[model samples]
Target: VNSFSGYLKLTDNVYIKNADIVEEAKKVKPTVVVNAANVYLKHGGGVAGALNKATNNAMQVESDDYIATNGPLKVGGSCVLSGHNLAKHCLHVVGPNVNKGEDIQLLKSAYENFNQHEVLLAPLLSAGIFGADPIHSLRVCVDTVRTNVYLAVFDKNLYDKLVSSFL
Candidate 1:
């Protein structure tokens, strides 16, 4: 897009962008957006915080209500929250904590369970505070994708690295 961003087409239906995830989610208007949520599904740092801010904290409140009713989700667990401020729904997935566990199956379940959507706004899951390597996470994202997606990386260096290494 020419609005004020840098991006590279990664595949027929995927692109990598160095821009704010929330802003791109607005621009693309995906059917749903992925939240790199905590086990408790709180609107904590990074993507969750971004979503909470983008929706004026409505997202966080909904998450709290969801937890109050359903209790906390474990690694690889997820829930769908509808009427998200951006998309028709938001898929909240608690990625595996590499820093704490060797259950790679946890990561796999998060992807396997995420199956349907016409359009999606996905971030590099588990690559931040959860300690999963960004490059490794990106590969899983590329292979498991089932719909139109924007694989966003907010850092310039990492974006460049992904393009050079994978594109």
Candidate 2:
């Protein structure tokens, strides 16, 4: 039964938008939602809206040309390091296999950059090398830093190898 105001008798308009109220007055249903995906604006919302809200506050940066850059190196024994907390001397299999190699000096520079910093948070970086894929790039990064630290491979085979060697 339609009430005198024609609004719902028992339920509140919790999910209803402002436009919905206007349409309800005229017996027309509102079809469009305002800021539908903006979580912060939604009655019950969080992080989903954070990115959009922060975009206005952020600025683009020019590349630091001083940083030495490198190649799509084929991962090999030459690149790998052994000793504390590492499974083997070098990674033989798994990850990307590419023909193009890395620039030694650039790798060295990268190491230096991370070395001086006490705290580091590296994002998923596309190496920008023509043939370098995610896995090989990650392997190369680990190998480069292994001298100062240790490589931790989440894969079962690599994990097993590390455990077995230590035992």
Candidate 3:
């Protein structure tokens, strides 16, 4: 029900964008979900919404409990948690709201942290309502990510741009 054929391969790993990351993760025995979460760890809309919904909303509850216990994740901060239903683990990260002057640095670190995971399903962090410019965010993803990542680009126009950029 989710996914598209767009792909961009780097020297280290394959990146298939414009696909449904949650389903894609499940397709290959499930990998860690690198969630594009708010600092508060709420999985409410867009990519997080899909992940939360697929996991029967346990993802949200898990994040809820995590933040309540550990406090709000800072921009560029991350934590690993149970995927709640499908995948075994979820790597939650807080991307910077792009309006800030330090957003580029913060966003870079956010994606950089994904390099730790050998395999994961990740969204275009901060590229949605967080208002990051897709061009820069894609560059950040391409520069970072030594791990195999299913890059789920949820926007139609942005998907085309990224596909051609690597196609």
Q: What TM-score does prediction 2 earn?
A: 0.26
Model 1, position 135, has a per-residue lDDT of: 81
Clashing pairs in 3: none
lDDT to native, each model: 0.76, 0.24, 0.75
Rank candidates, lDDT, best first.
1, 3, 2
lDDT by residue for model 2 over 130-156, one digit each (tens)?
234434434444444432222222234
Name the 10 consecutive residues with the lowest summed lDDT in model 2. Answer: 58-67
How far residue 82's Cα lies from its native spot in candidate 1, in Å, is 3.0
Per-residue lDDT tens digits for candidate 3, residues 47-138, read: 77878888888888888898789899889989999977657788988888765544567888898888888777778788777778877777
The C-alpha stretches of model 1 lying farther than 4 A from their native spots are 1-7
For candidate 3, what's the RMSD?
Answer: 3.5
**Which residue pairs come into collision in candidate 2?**
73-101
- Estimate candidate 2's RMSD in Å: 23.8
Candidate 1 — what's its lDDT? 0.76
Top lDDT prediction, candidate number: 1
